[PDB]
């Protein structure tokens, strides 16, 4: 059994039903499961999804699209991206001591206070969602910037679409 | 045909981004239409240079309006 709402924040267990349907080669199912849930394979699945990851030495960065992983024009969440959310939780389970920073970014158009409010709300919702899986609150710090710096230009339509983002940085020490 | 149905596809947003009625003054009158100009330079001929900083033009004088206009008179 499974619940699409986050499995009620319960620890997921895929390998048991995988080796059950493999016996219905249990060891074959186990080695297939440790192949499938591995860091390379979960990064490949997260790249099949529209999620960007960059590792550069020790600092590691994750990039989420607001317009596809959010409910529109709101701090509310998109709901269909729950397998990507579960993959995010499964990947971030591997770093149980790293300090986390999270930030939000938007485009150029609107009131500056409005953009700051929206980005702060989105970052706080992401912070609370990550805390909802039981992570300690001192491990994280959230901030929503407006249009202080973007990886694209706001004059181009596609670049202005690229401008809004969710950034998750974490160190190693 | 394609651009007309695409225009019709987003009807409420056009009214959201264009509202003459909010700019309609209390005596049912359209506000007059203006135009601006910054840092104008005219070279009419030799021995003559005309330079201005800002300029403004009343294009259309104000008048009565029975009903507020719409985007359909301008973009359809």
């Amino acid at each position: 059994c499974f619940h699409p709402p986050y499995n009620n924040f319960q620890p997921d267990r895929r390998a048991v039903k995988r080796v059950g349907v493999d016996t219905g080669g249990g060891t074959v199912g186990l080695v297939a499961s440790i192949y499938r849930d591995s860091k390379r394979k979960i990064i490949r699945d997260l790249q099949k999804q529209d999620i960007q990851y960059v590792e550069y030495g020790d600092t590691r960065t994750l990039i989420i699209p607001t317009d596809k992983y959010f409910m529109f024009s709101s701090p509310r969440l998109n709901e269909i991206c729950y397998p990507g959310l579960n993959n995010v939780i499964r990947l971030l389970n591997f770093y149980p001591q790293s300090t986390i920073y999270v930030a939000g970014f938007t485009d150029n158009v609107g009131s500056r206070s409005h953009k700051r409010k929206l980005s702060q709300a989105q970052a706080e919702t992401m912070m609370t969602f990550l805390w909802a899986n039981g992570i300690a609150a001192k491990r994280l710090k959230a901030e929503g910037y407006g249009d202080k710096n973007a990886i694209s230009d706001n004059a181009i339509i596609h670049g202005s679409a690229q401008n809004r983002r969710i950034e998750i940085q974490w160190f190693t020490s | 045909k394609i651009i007309d149905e695409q225009l019709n596809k987003q009807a409420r947003n056009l009214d959201a981004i264009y509202d003459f009625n909010s700019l309609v003054l209390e005596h049912n009158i359209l506000p007059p239409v203006l135009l601006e100009g910054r840092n104008t330079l005219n070279l009419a001929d030799a021995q003559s240079i005309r330079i201005s900083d800002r300029t403004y033009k009343v294009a259309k004088q104000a008048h009565f309006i029975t009903t507020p206009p719409t985007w359909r008179q301008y973009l359809w």
Partner: protein
Amino acid sequence: LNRFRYEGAGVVTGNNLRTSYLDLYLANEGTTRLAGNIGLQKLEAVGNGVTQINGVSSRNLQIVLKGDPKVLISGFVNLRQLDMYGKGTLSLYWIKSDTLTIRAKKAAKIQLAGIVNRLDVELWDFAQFKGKYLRAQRSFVKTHDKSVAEISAVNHQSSLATDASDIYYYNLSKTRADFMAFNGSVLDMREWGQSDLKDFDRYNKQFP
């Protein structure tokens, strides 16, 4: 005047005691009535007894309870942390501190009000926290089965409930985030009769 430990079924009553620090230990029905301006850093009581203290100017304190005590404290306490495991009943009038971490296991009844910059509270089972009129800039609430929480968060609200848990806020937060797992509930619990009550705005309107 540095220490007082009492055991063995007695009543201690005093007033006008000025101190920088005294080590207080209470056990076996210490009926304690204190009416002095006591400044202290450490206090301890076991439980199954009453204690009424009026006037505390403490820069730091930490209380751990094991029995079922009934404590009321007046004054101003810069508190740090609290863990409860029995059937405790505590009331503190003013607390101007910064960060509070509260763990509740079995049964607690705490009456708190004041200014808190950052607060986190974990409730396990049959635990009540009536933290109304206690203003928290950052509020974190994590509640397991059969938990009661009444919060007064002002800016940033974070709440999670597993099953059969009730969390009621009493102030409109700028940022609100709530989650229920099996049968949790987070409610607004306002009056609908205030002549100047504000409603949901653009940014805080998170639909439950």
